Enzyme design. Sequence first.
Site, PDB file in Angstrom:
ATOM      1  N   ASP B 189       0.863  -1.178   0.000  1.00 12.70           N
ATOM      2  CA  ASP B 189       0.000   0.000   0.000  1.00 12.70           C
ATOM      3  C   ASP B 189       0.900   1.229   0.000  1.00 12.70           C
ATOM      4  OD1 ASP B 189      -2.333   1.674   0.301  1.00 12.70           O
ATOM      5  OD2 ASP B 189      -1.881   1.772   2.445  1.00 12.70           O
ATOM      6  N   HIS B 345       7.089   4.095   6.107  1.00 11.08           N
ATOM      7  CA  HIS B 345       7.290   3.952   4.676  1.00 11.08           C
ATOM      8  C   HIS B 345       8.368   4.922   4.215  1.00 11.08           C
ATOM      9  CE1 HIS B 345       4.851   1.039   2.577  1.00 11.08           C
ATOM     10  NE2 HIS B 345       3.802   1.326   3.326  1.00 11.08           N
ATOM     11  N   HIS B 379       6.675  -2.164   3.683  1.00  8.30           N
ATOM     12  CA  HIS B 379       6.732  -3.617   3.829  1.00  8.30           C
ATOM     13  C   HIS B 379       7.857  -4.216   2.989  1.00  8.30           C
ATOM     14  CE1 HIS B 379       2.977  -3.470   6.052  1.00  8.30           C
ATOM     15  NE2 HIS B 379       2.443  -2.766   5.071  1.00  8.30           N
ATOM     16  N   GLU B 404       4.287  -9.221  -0.810  1.00 10.53           N
ATOM     17  CA  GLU B 404       2.883  -8.940  -0.510  1.00 10.53           C
ATOM     18  C   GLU B 404       2.041  -9.201  -1.746  1.00 10.53           C
ATOM     19  OE1 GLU B 404       2.091  -5.165   1.195  1.00 10.53           O
ATOM     20  OE2 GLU B 404      -0.080  -5.447   1.266  1.00 10.53           O
ATOM     21  N   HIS B 406      -1.510  -8.973  -1.777  1.00  9.39           N
ATOM     22  CA  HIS B 406      -2.817  -8.633  -1.222  1.00  9.39           C
ATOM     23  C   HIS B 406      -3.913  -8.630  -2.283  1.00  9.39           C
ATOM     24  CE1 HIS B 406      -5.128  -5.869   1.815  1.00  9.39           C
ATOM     25  NE2 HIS B 406      -5.503  -7.133   1.886  1.00  9.39           N
ATOM     26  N   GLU B 449       0.366  -9.411   4.496  1.00  8.11           N
ATOM     27  CA  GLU B 449      -0.863  -9.541   3.707  1.00  8.11           C
ATOM     28  C   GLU B 449      -0.669 -10.409   2.461  1.00  8.11           C
ATOM     29  OE1 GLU B 449      -1.924  -5.458   3.425  1.00  8.11           O
ATOM     30  OE2 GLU B 449      -3.709  -5.652   4.682  1.00  8.11           O
ATOM     31  N   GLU B 525       0.193  -3.790  13.170  1.00  7.18           N
ATOM     32  CA  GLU B 525      -0.429  -2.552  12.722  1.00  7.18           C
ATOM     33  C   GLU B 525      -1.630  -2.272  13.609  1.00  7.18           C
ATOM     34  OE1 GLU B 525      -1.392  -2.508   8.499  1.00  7.18           O
ATOM     35  OE2 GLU B 525       0.614  -3.280   8.061  1.00  7.18           O
ATOM     36  N   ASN B 585      -8.080   4.103  -8.276  1.00  8.52           N
ATOM     37  CA  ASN B 585      -7.241   4.584  -7.191  1.00  8.52           C
ATOM     38  C   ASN B 585      -8.018   4.528  -5.884  1.00  8.52           C
ATOM     39  OD1 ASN B 585      -8.617   7.411  -6.907  1.00  8.52           O
ATOM     40  ND2 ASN B 585      -8.030   7.280  -9.069  1.00  8.52           N
ATOM     41  N   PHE B 589      -6.415   7.297   0.898  1.00 10.42           N
ATOM     42  CA  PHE B 589      -5.933   6.276   1.822  1.00 10.42           C
ATOM     43  C   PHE B 589      -4.411   6.145   1.838  1.00 10.42           C
ATOM     44  CE2 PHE B 589     -10.167   4.870   2.643  1.00 10.42           C
ATOM     45  CZ  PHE B 589     -10.085   4.093   3.779  1.00 10.42           C
ATOM     46  N   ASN B 592      -1.823   8.216   6.186  1.00  6.03           N
ATOM     47  CA  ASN B 592      -2.177   7.637   7.475  1.00  6.03           C
ATOM     48  C   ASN B 592      -1.148   7.974   8.548  1.00  6.03           C
ATOM     49  OD1 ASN B 592      -4.239   6.115   5.926  1.00  6.03           O
ATOM     50  ND2 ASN B 592      -2.484   4.874   5.290  1.00  6.03           N
TER      51      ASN B 592
END
Lengths: 1011, 1011
Positions: B189, B345, B379, B404, B406, B449, B525, B585, B589, B592
């Site tokens: 993400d 990140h 990640h 990942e 996901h 994930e 998380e 998109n 999000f 964060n």
Amino acid sequence: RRDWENPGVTQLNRLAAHPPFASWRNSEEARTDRPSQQLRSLNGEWRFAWFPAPEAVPESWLECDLPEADTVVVPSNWQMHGYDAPIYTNVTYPITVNPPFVPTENPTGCYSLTFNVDESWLQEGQTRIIFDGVNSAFHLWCNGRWVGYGQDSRLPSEFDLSAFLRAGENRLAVMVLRWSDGSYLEDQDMWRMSGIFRDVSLLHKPTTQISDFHVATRFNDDFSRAVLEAEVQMCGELRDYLRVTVSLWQGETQVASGTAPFGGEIIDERGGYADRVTLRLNVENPKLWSAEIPNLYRAVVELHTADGTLIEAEACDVGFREVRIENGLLLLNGKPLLIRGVNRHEHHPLHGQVMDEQTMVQDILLMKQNNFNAVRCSHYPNHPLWYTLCDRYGLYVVDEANIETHGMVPMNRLTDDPRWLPAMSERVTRMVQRDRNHPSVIIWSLGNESGHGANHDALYRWIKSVDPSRPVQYEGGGADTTATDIICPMYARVDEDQPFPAVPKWSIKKWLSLPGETRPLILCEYAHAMGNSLGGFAKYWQAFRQYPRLQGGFVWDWVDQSLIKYDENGNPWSAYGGDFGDTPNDRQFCMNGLVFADRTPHPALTEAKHQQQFFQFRLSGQTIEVTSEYLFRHSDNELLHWMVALDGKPLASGEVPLDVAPQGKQLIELPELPQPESAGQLWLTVRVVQPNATAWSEAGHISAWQQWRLAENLSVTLPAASHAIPHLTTSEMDFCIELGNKRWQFNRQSGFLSQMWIGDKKQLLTPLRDQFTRAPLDNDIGVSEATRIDPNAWVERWKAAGHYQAEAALLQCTADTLADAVLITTAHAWQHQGKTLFISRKTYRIDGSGQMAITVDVEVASDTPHPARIGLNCQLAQVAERVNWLGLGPQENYPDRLTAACFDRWDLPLSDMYTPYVFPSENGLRCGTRELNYGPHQWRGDFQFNISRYSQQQLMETSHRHLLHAEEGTWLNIDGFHMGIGGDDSWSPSVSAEFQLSAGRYHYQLVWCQK
Amino acid sequence: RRDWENPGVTQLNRLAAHPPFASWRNSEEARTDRPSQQLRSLNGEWRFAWFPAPEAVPESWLECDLPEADTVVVPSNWQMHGYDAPIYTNVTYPITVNPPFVPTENPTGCYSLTFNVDESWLQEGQTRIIFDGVNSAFHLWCNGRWVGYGQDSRLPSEFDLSAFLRAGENRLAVMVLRWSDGSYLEDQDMWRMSGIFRDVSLLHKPTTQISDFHVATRFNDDFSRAVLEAEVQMCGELRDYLRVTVSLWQGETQVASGTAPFGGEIIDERGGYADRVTLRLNVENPKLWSAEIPNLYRAVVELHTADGTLIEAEACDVGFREVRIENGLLLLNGKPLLIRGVNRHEHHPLHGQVMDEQTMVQDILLMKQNNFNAVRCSHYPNHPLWYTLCDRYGLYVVDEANIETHGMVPMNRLTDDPRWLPAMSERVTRMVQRDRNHPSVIIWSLGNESGHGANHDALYRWIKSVDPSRPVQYEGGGADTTATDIICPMYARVDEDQPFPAVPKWSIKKWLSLPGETRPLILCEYAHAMGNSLGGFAKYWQAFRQYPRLQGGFVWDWVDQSLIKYDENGNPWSAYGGDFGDTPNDRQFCMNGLVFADRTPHPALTEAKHQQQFFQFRLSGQTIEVTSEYLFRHSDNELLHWMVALDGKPLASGEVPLDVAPQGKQLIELPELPQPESAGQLWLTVRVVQPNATAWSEAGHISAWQQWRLAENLSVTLPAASHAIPHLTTSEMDFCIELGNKRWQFNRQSGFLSQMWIGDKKQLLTPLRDQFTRAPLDNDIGVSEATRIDPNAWVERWKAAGHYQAEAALLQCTADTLADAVLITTAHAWQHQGKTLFISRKTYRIDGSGQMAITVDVEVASDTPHPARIGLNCQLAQVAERVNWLGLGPQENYPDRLTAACFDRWDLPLSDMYTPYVFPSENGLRCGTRELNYGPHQWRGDFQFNISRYSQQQLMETSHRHLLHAEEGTWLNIDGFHMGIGGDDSWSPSVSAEFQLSAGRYHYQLVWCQK
């Protein structure tokens, strides 16, 4: 690019592994396992060319085959056709150790096949090609267009030819390389050869397919209700009308069925697989599968539509059994298994490593008839028909991955390197994906002799993650690593310890008792039967039966790996390493099997049969306790036949039907046994006979036997006073004894019996002397050669002490006449370099009745190595057709291997008295012999005799059995005492101290007469 | 061949992974970490071209660069230069889901570098090139000759250019592809971009090399004696004169040393490694490493000769610490850790995903100043300088593999497939091989994930096999799988359960109490701080401190991932997903973080600081219990400053030096506190101040604080009798009240306060009405958009019930004069579609002294959703520069997030009262306010106020903070009751029931006057 010199590339455009597929279009044809016309066999006449290097291959071969190329049959190995020399090596790699690079001189085989494909195959569906095995790596071209690359050698490689095939004439071109980077993982102790040694097939599937299916069985504590879980994976377009039917059949009777549309349970936060579906079939009172009663079901998976129109069908064989480990015990169906396994190499008698159904069936029949219930696929996955035949006939299978890096120094150099972690995974995971549906496979194996690395641990617990239904094992790292549920050392001994640094092989009884250890012990390799071997097998099976956590082992191995060569006259003869020009080589270490290359049994197979009997016998008083070792079957096809013999003469016998529960006990009360007043020993012999014919045995097969000594009558009678007395005449060099017809002559210079005369026929070609040396056995030599000498080997200790070289010196030789006999007293001593090793004192009494009694007393020094033999040696001048003997037999037996032979009167041809071992050594010995009759001669006493046409000196000099030539007369070796043969391993002294001639003083008596 | 569309090929001719190498030729230069001239930086001006597909690249680019290509700086991402649009997606893959095939439209970046190599580099040794990170896959050419291929994006790719480089001018050509088969394992993400985003270096080594070295530390129970085991692996020729020296240094003082020749212990039956050597250095009383006191040693490994001539030297940093798990507890140095971690990140404020040392140092300083002791490399593996800075500054690091999937449906589609087992291993094993020597790294992570497959289990226990010194964790499969020692769910709540099918997120207290569960719980998380968020953090840390096996967690996440765009005038502004043309998109999000993109702290960072304090306070009587949560350090740089305030007026204060043992208790006895007879509440505030400057903090840094209520003096005084009484005049449409200067006007049609006059200045632009709705927060919206509506979201429930649409209906509006006041009684009701949601009854008492008292009683229906707000709303006509308030502050706080704010008198600029969230929402609320002064106006009572220049309607309509325009006057929202903001996650209703306006009847009083 050189893909064969890069471990990161193991395949290119190769399809995923799956259980075997036949692509049926009719469920009834799948249920009965009828052949499918969607599967075509490409086996047959292919065009073949040989090149010293892949770069030497012309590119015109990609367009059309060369006119100079020959026609071969596929499957085959081109080392069996003269294009190369097959290379035998045990530990040392056949190439220069420089991973992942192979030598520039890489032998290349170019195969080509011209064929036709039906146009119905091209219009719809997917057409794929399956190579069941290619050694080692190969590149594939279809119609001159490159398709893919394969690297593994013992697992099928599948490629999609749908976009390559054309209507009419199609040409396929395969370039096979002898050496690749994967050959560093292929260091198995076998003949290194190369080629397309397994089947080539062409499979046609529809657009939507059955890509995979997994079948598992779950039980309760009683095994009366079963759940068959069949998970089905498809490829192609997902349509709502697609349905699957999973049908279970016993014969023609449907037991359970289930139909569900595609779509699985929710697994993750994103949902579940839309292309997978699981079916749960409930079975009431299933017939369990085992090596004793192999109950099989047929599972048919039909992908079809909602209308009922069948799209495709795939069928497999399902056995309801559950293998697990609890309390440190391996249980199958809730019962502790006792493994009677054997290691098997895929070695065809004529075609090398090309296996057909006939050889598989024959091997299975000889294993089952010799009380073997398990087999180890060593050290690689086998032909997929082998597993199916094992399910049909009932043999446990340990499936082993094609990984072995025994030549690496250290042995875990590649298995600890993460760079080789991908490639090794491709040799493990795919194997599981091929063989997780066979109930015969009960134990997975990571490989053999690769040390311990993290890749082994990772792949180990990967198998634990995907397939919890089977325990998984591994030897490397000392057999105590975290990568095994089952303790599997190789050649660990029963009682004595051999503590190598950081990889010690403790004794199995001590191993089980180590602090913190829980797992069961099943020996991956034990009882090395290399030539005249397999001593101490009784100790191994006594330990197995006494200890609950000692659950048997696998004998190394089944069949000798010898290749057929031809002489100047074209006569075939078996050959070993170094007979093809391969250098370096491990010379006869390729022949360790219990049967010959043509599946002729060795004498060790009888011992293996007797030590692995499913019936144990205990004689108490006059009753017999019969204990079954079957775990799942009742004694419904067995009867006990007993007999009583006085010195080989039958007196009474009878047959009793056996009614024994599994691992149960039965009492058999014998009738009033005879009570002879004649001298001799009474022997009671019992045999278990199968009256009916099983799928693996014939009517009257003997599965077990036992012998005991009954009451004995010692002889107290006296011989009559012979009217004639032997005349003794003393010459200046000879002693001559007359008894009318019979004349004995002793030479006073050598002190031995020079000559015997009956009439005017001479009977001795060589004088009767002492013998303390035998032809060295394969266990005696070990790993010692002429270039490198191992001082621990028995033969090197014997020839270093001068046992083969010591010369007899005459100390005393006197003669004197008695009242009714002539007495000859001799005394010699064997000396080497001024050291006296043996002293022999003999007394020859020549009676007037005709018998010559020899008493021999031998003194053996304690500091010299213990002799292999203490006895007499002579060469008779007469070749008789038959040999009779009252003693143990009728097979070859030795002091440490004699529990299988029975005491009786055996009459055999002379050629049967010689065991045709490929590597010549001591053979044909018969122990416990009370009487021996040959021609006119009779020998009495207690002795171990071997009679043959070949001298021990010839057996020592000669390295191949076909070079042996029969000598004049007949060589006889009667021995008072003989040393055991060993057999724990073939690189260390394996003879136990109780079977060594270590007392120092020995005595034996013989009687020589004319019957 | 298309290597980017084949998971079996992840590299070609790529060198093995290793710890970072500088190739020093002087041990003193290695000890001090001076720069090495054998390592050259290729960062700088490269030539760059962009192509829509790799097939569109001309081959003339292999010979020379194109004249149409531009000059860029390396490292960078070409999405930050206009060549492509960076794509933001959370779960959905940015390409068509069809593994392992990528779209034909694959964006291609062609990089070229022209440089020179010294001739001394070419004569001897090996020259290699290191790419620290290339997104995603790349092909390499040196001087027009193909070198190799790389696929991984977050780990260095190293290639040998010794046989490619030439004297003089050399050209390197890199072809980088945006999409590859490895991008299926890169579904993190974040902003999907591509290019050479990390350093490019050129390294020169000798012929014989230090290929690898592993450093481990072993302790006793007391941690007073340590064994440093350094295992060294070489490449090149094995010579008998080669020696290694391992030297340990603390500063300039040598602690221990060891010299041994090459050759290891016997491991297998074949021996040991001849190219490896292990050294065991004994250290007496080592200085242990931790996040509190990061004690570091310098370990220098010198490969040299027996003469002492140095060949090569490699240096690393070693911290003596031991991380293990016992009794279900994670211990570092024998003490149970309490993780105060945060997810990070790698997002540069200006250069996207290109990280430099300055941003790392700044981020570490803000984390350490805000009581964060751990960080999660999420990640993916980070820049190798990040780990070194973490060892220097003392932060625990969880190193996570770049895996990942996901977007797979199901999420474990690739991780259960054995075909992806190799590639995933290349993303795990190499990571360990890069980061097993950093003491900052304490926990390995398989990824995030990806569901649960057998590949996760295999790689997990592979890490367990190679590196037992660190525990290793994984979230996928429900965080209870066999692939974790540490329980790490994401966004599991403290008390309530959310049972998703087959992956349930039970509450942490219930999770710890499950049958058979033992492992510790550390949240991977939690506390999603997406915008105005982080409610319930106090509950999380109360659970962490109360429960021994709840050892903290990692907050998601550190920094907002917003990209800078420019408007028509060139003014920069932060932007989120969908602002670059990327479709589909996940719109905002990407933000964060607890700090802005320019590292400006959010108000949530203060709450995170207060809830993670290492000092806990307990007031009893007049004494204070101070309990340390430090585990290894003594309170040597802390003092307690206390103060007493009567309604924001200081009375007494003092400073006490702190002397607390690790996890110890100290008593502080305050002097005789003041006892005022004036009305008001006494507040006691304590702060922990560091007088000296640490490497991460400045002199006077406050690390902890706490506030309590002391004795209270209730006001019983009466106001004086005002001589003037308000004149009330009744018009046909208005009620007008005079008090001389001050004039109130109520509109009888709407029933609200229409206008206020002081002199001739109007004070209200909009009438004072009720407000029951706020601008929806990011937690309120959740994952609901215009196209897809989530009925569980709070904003959708509010607008479905008509809360944003309900119209006020006037039920009653009466006025009557009292003896010394004028009484105004109003009563309204809010109705939507014939349903009455709220009923408001207000009483306005206008006294002669000047104060206007408003009593508000609100009835709320039980069946309608609970309102986010119950209060008043008006727009003042005056913009003042300062805002004063006696209450909680000075930061933004909410009913569920207010434990960090202190009660005092705060004066702030008006622009400081607005929190500049990128996505506009409700912000700037101040809770617990007792007095509010703005311009001439004063408000008294107990209320929650927010004052700004933007209306709630504008904050609702507008989607970017730069589109907000200041309105006339000043918007004020005084609320009797306010609803909590949530923050457990940002896709479910996270507001707890105790923070919801669910009583049904509410009452509040305000006093409005002119100070």
